[PDB]
Scaffold this active site. Structure first.
Site, PDB file in Angstrom:
ATOM      1  N   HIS A  35      23.577 -16.521   1.897  1.00 52.86           N
ATOM      2  CA  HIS A  35      23.430 -17.912   1.453  1.00 52.86           C
ATOM      3  C   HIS A  35      23.824 -18.125  -0.003  1.00 52.86           C
ATOM      4  CE1 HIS A  35      19.250 -16.846  -0.019  1.00 52.86           C
ATOM      5  NE2 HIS A  35      19.694 -17.594  -1.012  1.00 52.86           N
ATOM      6  N   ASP A  59      21.595 -13.598   7.250  1.00 49.86           N
ATOM      7  CA  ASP A  59      21.645 -13.954   5.830  1.00 49.86           C
ATOM      8  C   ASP A  59      22.102 -12.763   4.996  1.00 49.86           C
ATOM      9  OD1 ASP A  59      21.616 -15.244   3.432  1.00 49.86           O
ATOM     10  OD2 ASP A  59      19.473 -15.687   3.385  1.00 49.86           O
ATOM     11  N   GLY A 138      16.598 -17.761  -7.779  1.00 46.52           N
ATOM     12  CA  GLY A 138      17.290 -16.820  -8.660  1.00 46.52           C
ATOM     13  C   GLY A 138      17.087 -15.393  -8.183  1.00 46.52           C
ATOM     14  N   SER A 140      17.124 -14.468  -5.079  1.00 48.99           N
ATOM     15  CA  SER A 140      17.753 -14.279  -3.773  1.00 48.99           C
ATOM     16  C   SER A 140      18.898 -13.280  -3.863  1.00 48.99           C
ATOM     17  CB  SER A 140      18.215 -15.614  -3.208  1.00 48.99           C
ATOM     18  OG  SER A 140      17.128 -16.542  -3.228  1.00 48.99           O
ATOM     19  N   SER A 155      16.095 -13.039   1.241  1.00 54.20           N
ATOM     20  CA  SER A 155      16.677 -14.182   1.949  1.00 54.20           C
ATOM     21  C   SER A 155      16.015 -15.517   1.638  1.00 54.20           C
ATOM     22  CB  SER A 155      16.639 -13.935   3.470  1.00 54.20           C
ATOM     23  OG  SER A 155      17.080 -15.057   4.240  1.00 54.20           O
TER      24      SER A 155
END
Ligand code: AES
Length: 186
Positions: A35, A59, A138, A140, A155
């Site tokens: 993502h 993801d 931030g 992720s 995720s």
């Protein structure tokens, strides 16, 4: 500079966290969350391009870097130092686990349930592992470790690290398999 899991990278208006250094044949890069950007997305610090991204549904993604940066088997521990990744042996449900990311540093919790489906606003993602660790925007893409064993990349989730929450990770082994990647280990 050294590519270190948990450190930030940038694209347009956004920040995500480097997951794990990887190789693909002679190419190098890092695993991350799908993502964070679709295939072909340019990234900076480090300079790179999103070489693969599957999101939603899964993801998972990776960024191919340039000669200006160097892969390491390292994750930022956020206390001045690092943890060395030695493999990706999957931890059991109930195991402790910790994540690293640019916004909240190092945070730990327990693996609660695997193969979970989350209906994100961009679409539904399956196969996720739910944990009791917290995360914030931030973080992720950042790595998850049980000891020296890579578990996944961040995720999504709910809440924050001030008051707590839950967080989902994309398991690392499916990501390495899908994109034909080798984990950088020490
Ligand atoms: S990203 O996948 O680290 C991420 C994690 C957690 C949040 C909390 C927002 N409620 C946002 C982004």
């Amino acid at each position: 500079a050294a590519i270190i899991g948990g450190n930030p990278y940038y694209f347009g208006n956004y920040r995500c966290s480097i997951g794990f250094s990887v190789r693909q044949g002679s190419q190098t890069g890092f695993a991350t969350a799908g993502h964070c950007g679709s295939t072909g997305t340019r990234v900076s610090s480090p300079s790179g391009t999103v070489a693969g991204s599957y999101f939603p549904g899964r993801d998972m993604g990776w960024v191919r870097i340039t000669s200006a940066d160097t892969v390491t088997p390292l994750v930022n521990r956020y206390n001045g130092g690092t943890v060395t990744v030695t493999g990706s042996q999957e931890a059991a449900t109930g195991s402790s686990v910790c994540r690293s990311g640019a916004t909240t540093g190092w945070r730990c919790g327990t693996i609660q349930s695997k193969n979970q489906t989350v209906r994100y606003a961009e679409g539904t993602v399956t196969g996720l592992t739910r944990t009791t660790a917290c995360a914030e925007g931030g973080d992720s893409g950042g790595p998850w470790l049980t000891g020296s064993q890579a578990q996944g990349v961040t995720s999504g989730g709910t809440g924050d690290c001030r008051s707590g929450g839950i967080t989902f990770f994309q398991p690392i082994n499916p990501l390495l398999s899908y994109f034909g990647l080798q984990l950088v280990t020490g």
